Structures are given as C-alpha cells and as structure tokens.
C-alpha cells in the first residue's frame, strides 16, 4: 500500500536528529527533577512524544501529552514501548479544546518555528497555562530573546560573483548576468531560512527583545508585534547583504541551561532568518547601522511570520523592507 | 523592485557550475572543430548562450540559439558582450516554431532531463533534425545510453535504522517508528532523484537502452516506451532498497567523448533516478536479479517521465511497481 507520510517522518527526524535541540530539552528538564518529581505535566505540541518520556524520565507522576497532527499515533506507540502508559497520556487535537481531569503543576514545549514566531506553538502554550497551569506552576522553557546582526553571507556572495568568474573557467563573459542574479536572489521580501557562521556576522550582534513566558500582556503583544530599535558597528569591510534574526531559549536552573540559534554556536534546524536587501551595500570598520526589527502576525494568517524592517546605514537615508515567510 | 526569477536564476547556475557537464560540452564541440567550422548550427534550448558561444569558438560561421524561457534575453546580452552578435543569433520561443533563413549542418543541445527524459527537450530535438537539419548533418551529442542496478542506498539505510538507534543517544525505544519510517520513505510511487556512489551499487551495472539520436524510429519507440530487460548477481549481502537508472551521452570523435552521469563516476546535477521498493529485501553475495525497465510518457504529460518496473529478486516472485517523477 502506499502512503504519503515522507513530509510528516521527515520534519520529525529532523528535530529528533537535532542533538542540540533534543538534549538541550532532556536536560532542560532534568534540571527540573526537584519541582517535577511527584507532579504533573502538560506537553503542548508533544509530537513522537519524546519530551514527554523525558519528563516522566524526571520522576513527573504524570503526563499529558497533547498533539493534533496525525503523529499522535506513533506518540501512544512510543510510550506503551516505554512501559509508560500508565503515567503518560496521548491526547489527540488541538489544546485549545483538549480536556483534562486537572489543572497542572508544569508546562512544557518546544514551540518555537523558524524566526521562533513562524507557524510557533507560542499562543498555544500560553492558551493552556491561562487555562490549565496552577498558580506557581512552571512552563520549560521559561524565557526567549531575540537576537539581529548585521551579515555578509559568503555563500550568497559567491552565487552573485559566479557569473564574473565564468570568463576564468571556460573562457565565456557572463558578467552581465550578475545583475539579473542580484534581482532574482535579493529583489524579493521573502525570508529566507538559511544557516550562517561567524564569518558572516558583520557586527556585534544585539538582543531586541526580551520574552518571559509567564509575564502578563504577551498574548497582546504577540498581536502587536514583538521587537525594537538596534544599533550597532560594523567590524570591516564588506558587502552587507543584510540582516539575520535568531533566538535562544532558557529553561530554569534548578546556572540556567541556554539553547542558542546563533551562528556563533552549534548548528539547530533552526538556522536563522535572513532578511536581505534588494542588493548589496559597501559597508567599512566603523560603519554604523541602526534601525528597528518587529516579528508580526501576517493578514491573513497570525502564524505566518512576518518581519518589518527599519535600517540606517551610515549616512544613507533609513529604509524600510516589509518580509514575510513564503 | 521586485521580481519573481529566484528558481530561474538557480538552475541555470547549477548547469553551468555542473564542470562535469559544462566542460565536456566544451571539449565535445571542439572535439569536432573540423565539422563546424564556417559551418552554420542550430542550439536548441538555448538557455543564457554558452553552448552556442562554444560552437563559434570552435569556428561555425554562424549559430542559431533559440530558446522559449525568459532567459532568452540574457542570452542575446550574453552573446553581445562577447562580441558575437554579428555570428550568434539569439530568436525566443520553441524551436517548433521559429523560422530560420536556412538549413543547418549541425544541431547542438543540452537536452537530458532527470532520467534522462524527465521535461527533456529530446522531442524537440528531433523535430528540428527533421525540419531544419541538411542531410549528413550531425548531432552533438550523437547518442546515448541507459544504466540500470540494484542498490542499497547508505543514506536511506541510515535513516530507516535512525529510530532504533534513539534508545542509544536519548535513553528512549523508537524502535517501533521504523515501520512508519519505511511506509513514509518507501511506500510510494515516485522517482526519487538523489546522488549516490558506488558504496551504494550492489550488483554490475546493466545497459538496458542505446539511443542512436539520428536512427529512424527513435520518436514513435519514446511514445511506446524505451527500455529493455536486465540480469544481474549481487555482489554481497545488505538491504536491497530498489533501483537506480542513469544515463550517459556520446560525442562523435573527430576516441569519443562521453558524459556520464553514473554513481561510480564524478558527480553532475543530473544525481540518478531512484526506483524503490515498498520495503527492503535482504539479498546475498550472488543472489540473482532480473527484471524490465521501461521509460514512458504520461498520460496526460508526455514529459513527465513514467518508469514502469518489472522485478524478481532470487526465488521471489517477479512484481510489477509503476513510478512517476512528481
Ligand atoms: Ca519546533
Ligand atoms: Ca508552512
Ligand atoms: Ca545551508
Ligand atoms: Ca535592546
Ligand atoms: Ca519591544
Ligand atoms: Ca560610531
Ligand atoms: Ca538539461
Ligand atoms: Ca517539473
Ligand atoms: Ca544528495
Ligand atoms: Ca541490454
Ligand atoms: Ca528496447
Ligand atoms: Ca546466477
């Protein structure tokens, strides 16, 4: 018989593979043992189920793992495979309309999308600790910042300079086609999902907002837009090509445990998110940029990420470029 | 502004960066200097102009690159900026229906698609024979070839196996998502295209098909079907995950040229087209595999490539599956 379950085992392979995602999130929680133990557990978004075994793994004395894709199935399979189906519960559908037989001492989900906000369980998370979390109650991870840099994306800058190369390698001019190039690969307002490294940062990188979880008006927030002003400058020369927007994560220490997107540190699916400028700018050691960065909820769809952007280089006038993900 | 040419501008830099192809194309015109020189060609699918612009550097007095795409104007600025345009003549829209002030004495094209006839632009090409070639005219290439052999894709295996090797990384059983995994990965009917090595390869590749590009008949046997029956032993044992179905081309001499686009030879964009089976069969050092391939126009796109498979493992019975590229 045939299926069309590729998409559904690839996205979960590729978190479950994510080691720095996954063992960030089995520490994360262990680190919990001492509020956990003997308690109960709301796992929004519980996928396979895996980080809700970690939580019963932390001595929880019971689990609900709530998740409304069509992996829920495999979830019951994985936990009975445990010898945890007992403790652990596999709830079908949405959270919003899920019903429990108590309230919970804990929240726990990795709900962050690309950019955090893209296709994020954020608002679910936060519909269920309104509904469902007692008062003192925890939610892992406790806490996101959101992080922008300035970047001269090498693998880009060789996509645009290939068609000048050309001549040196098989003796035909296609220098011309480096403007069509720029057109196609800048001249858009998508964003773009893509990973960088260090030697793309162009300037230090500045946090513009701070998230605690569990803080009062976030939900509003979320509605309005999430972000601030930035102001930074830049390290050398280079084509600036851009800006990349990333997060971190931080659960309770029970020394908190930090799990970064940055280029800085070890690859996640997450990458980052790019948002380039319909072309290149020559930028200098000591060029300053400022600006202002807002994730917001699209039009017509509150969890397709959009991203608006204010920028200053040096002495030109500040621009705006509105991006949203595809 | 804006513009909508990312997916184009991608794929015509990922056939020129092809060296492996863009090179032997070089070399297999030049190979055939003493036919083309003051002699007039005809490149179709033309694309940014490379072919072409090779073939007035192997001396043709004139060249005729047509190409229906929107690429067609880079193209002529192309030819322009390497002084060409008095020689090279870049006309818009399909070949089918462009009209030339002449009979050529050559036909030049980069016509394979993925599996050879995936969205090719081989019927093309021989409607131009007919229509604009002289008679001793030639064909670059002049042929080709069709492979197939049986593999055990690594990269597969790794991630069919991925959900039992959870338990040693996370102290969690996935062991039961390995069904799931093969009904998602394998349980289909599409030709999956994806590049492999000869660590992949378990039994001697088989020629299934020659094209002579310039025989009679060639056009009805692409609308019945081209294709034919193989034997082979396995060389050891491991888990057979289907079929792999390559191709190569041939330039006439002026020893041939061929471009090959097998897993034991250099890579090129073209990978291979691979043909899975529900689910992986062990075989052993010199368990026997016959079978038939036949590469097929579908029914309502004749260039979307339709491969139907007959197989019989060892002393298993022969089964029948039918693919298509998405
Ligand atoms: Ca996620
Ligand atoms: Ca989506
Ligand atoms: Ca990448
Ligand atoms: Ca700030
Ligand atoms: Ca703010
Ligand atoms: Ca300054
Ligand atoms: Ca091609
Ligand atoms: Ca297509
Ligand atoms: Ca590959
Ligand atoms: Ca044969
Ligand atoms: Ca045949
Ligand atoms: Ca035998």
């Not at 709830?91 to 994020?120: C, F, K, N, Q």
Request: charged share 20%; with cysteine; net charge negative.
């Amino acid at each position: 018989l045939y299926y069309e379950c590729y998409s559904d085992v690839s996205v979960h392979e590729e978190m479950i593979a994510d080691q720095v995602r996954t063992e960030a999130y089995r520490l994360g929680i262990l680190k919990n043992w001492a509020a956990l133990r003997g308690k109960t557990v709301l796992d929004v978004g519980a996928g396979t189920g895996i980080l809700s075994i970690f939580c019963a793994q932390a001595g929880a004395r019971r689990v609900y793992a709530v998740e409304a894709s069509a992996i829920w199935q495999q979830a019951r399979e994985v936990v009975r495979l445990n010898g945890l189906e007992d403790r652990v519960h596999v709830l079908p559908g949405p959270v919003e309309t899920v019903e429990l037989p108590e309230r919970v001492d804990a929240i726990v989900s990795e709900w962050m999308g690309y950019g955090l906000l893209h296709e994020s369980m954020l608002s679910s998370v936060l519909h269920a600790r309104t509904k469902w979390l007692k008062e003192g109650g925890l939610l892992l991870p406790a806490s996101a910042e959101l992080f922008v840099a300035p970047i001269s994306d090498q693998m880009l800058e060789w996509r645009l300079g290939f068609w000048s190369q050309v001549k040196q390698h098989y003796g035909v001019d296609m220098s011309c086609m480096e403007s069509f190039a720029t057109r196609c690969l800048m001249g858009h307002s998508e964003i773009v999902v893509q990973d960088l490294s260090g030697e793309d940062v162009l300037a230090r990188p500045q946090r513009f907002a701070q998230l605690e979880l569990a803080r009062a008006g976030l939900e509003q927030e979320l509605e309005a837009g999430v972000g601030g002003r930035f102001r930074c400058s830049c390290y050398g020369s280079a084509p600036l090509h851009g800006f990349a927007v990333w997060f971190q994560v931080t659960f309770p220490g029970g020394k908190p445990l930090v799990l970064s997107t940055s280029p800085l540190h070890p690859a996640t699916h997450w990458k980052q998110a790019l948002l380039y400028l319909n072309e290149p700018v020559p930028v200098e050691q000591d060029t300053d940029i400022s600006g202002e960065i807002t994730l917001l909820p699209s039009p017509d769809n509150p969890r397709r990420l959009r991203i608006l952007l204010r920028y200053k280089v040096g002495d030109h006038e500040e621009k705006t470029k509105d991006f949203a993900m595809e």
